[PDB]
């Protein structure tokens, strides 16, 4: 069928408005389903690499909103700590809000 | 009273030994160190079982941490040695680990064990 990768196309879309709307949809659906959230963590991590600052901020806020059930791995943790290095203060504050609620499995992650 | 806001004169030392027990690598020298750690911890278990059970959530968290790693690295890193050591220690803390206070960390350890069983059932 042609419905495969709908959210893949949405998050890879060239307009940041479409990507922000996709982020909101991911937020609502993840608040509904935890398994879908676990599946879609990686795409949110990719959005943390997004070139538009607002998209990064909103994706981080949604990840914070849905962190209550998921638990990350070492790949996710190093990628998240990577974007925290960035210069802009507001996105760093957003990462700080994220880490307040994020889960972790290994002590080495901490 | 084991859950009280109190400090044991020996707790830090058994913490040191349980860190030595859990932390291991492929090194046979570190495996000998872990075997000695299991020996001392087991002697403390049979001698002073209540002291170890106060540190149960710690080793439970370590068991939680170590469970994800795939079977091949699990066997090569000797993590099965750690798993059988903690399982034997829990067996040797038999009539006291089933209390209400130790129930949560016990369930955590059992959760780690069953997660290991499911992941490497092949």
Curated annotation (Swiss-Prot), chain A:
It comes from the Eukaryota. It is found in: Nucleus; Cytoplasm. HEAT repeats lie at residues 1-33, 34-72, 74-110. Component of the Integrator complex, composed of core subunits INTS1, INTS2, INTS3, INTS4, INTS5, INTS6, INTS7, INTS8, INTS9/RC74, INTS10, INTS11/CPSF3L, INTS12, INTS13, INTS14 and INTS15. The core complex associates with protein phosphatase 2A subunits PPP2CA and PPP2R1A, to form the Integrator-PP2A (INTAC) complex. INTS4 is part of the RNA endonuclease subcomplex, composed of INTS4, INTS9, INTS11 and inositol hexakisphosphate (InsP6). Interacts with BRAT1; interaction is required for the assembly of the RNA endonuclease subcomplex. Belongs to the Integrator subunit 4 family. Component of the integrator complex, a multiprotein complex that terminates RNA polymerase II (Pol II) transcription in the promoter-proximal region of genes. This is Integrator complex subunit 4. The chain holds residues 373 to 482 of 963 of the full protein.
Swiss-Prot record, chain B:
It is found in: Nucleus; Nucleus membrane. Component of the integrator complex, a multiprotein complex that terminates RNA polymerase II (Pol II) transcription in the promoter-proximal region of genes. It is linked to Neurodevelopmental disorder with cataracts, poor growth, and dysmorphic facies: An autosomal recessive neurodevelopmental disorder characterized by severe global developmental delay with motor impairment, cognitive delays, absent or severely limited speech, dysmorphic features, hypotonia and cataracts. Component of the Integrator complex, composed of core subunits INTS1, INTS2, INTS3, INTS4, INTS5, INTS6, INTS7, INTS8, INTS9/RC74, INTS10, INTS11/CPSF3L, INTS12, INTS13, INTS14 and INTS15. The core complex associates with protein phosphatase 2A subunits PPP2CA and PPP2R1A, to form the Integrator-PP2A (INTAC) complex. Interacts with ESRRB, ESRRB is not a core component of the Integrator complex and this association is a bridge for the interaction with the multiprotein complex Integrator; attracts the transcriptional machinery. Belongs to the Integrator subunit 1 family. This is Integrator complex subunit 1. The lineage of its organism: Eukaryota, Metazoa, Chordata, Craniata, Vertebrata. The gene is INTS1.
């Amino acid at each position: 069928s042609g419905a495969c990768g709908a959210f893949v196309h949405g998050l890879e879309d060239e307009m940041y408005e479409v990507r922000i709307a996709a982020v909101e949809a991911l937020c609502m659906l993840a608040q509904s389903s935890p398994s879908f959230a676990e599946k879609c963590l990686d795409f949110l991590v990719d959005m943390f690499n997004d070139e538009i600052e607002e998209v990064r901020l909103q994706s981080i806020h949604t990840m914070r909103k849905i962190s209550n059930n998921i638990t990350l791995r070492e790949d996710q943790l190093d990628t998240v700590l990577a974007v925290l290095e960035d210069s802009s203060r507001d996105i760093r504050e957003a990462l700080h809000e994220l880490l307040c609620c994020t889960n972790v499995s290994t002590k080495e992650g901490i | 009273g084991a859950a009280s806001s109190s400090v044991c004169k020996l707790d830090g030392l058994i913490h040191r030994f349980i860190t030595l027990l859990a932390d291991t690598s492929d090194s046979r020298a570190l495996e000998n160190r872990g075997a000695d750690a299991s020996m001392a911890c087991r002697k403390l278990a049979v001698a002073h079982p209540l002291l170890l059970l106060r540190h149960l959530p710690m080793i439970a968290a370590l068991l939680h941490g170590r469970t994800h790693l795939n079977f091949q690295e699990f066997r090569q890193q000797n993590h099965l040695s750690c798993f059988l050591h903690v399982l034997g220690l829990l067996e040797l803390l038999q009539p006291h680990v089933f209390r209400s206070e130790h129930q949560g960390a016990l369930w955590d350890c059992l959760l780690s064990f069953i997660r290991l069983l499911l992941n490497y059932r092949k």
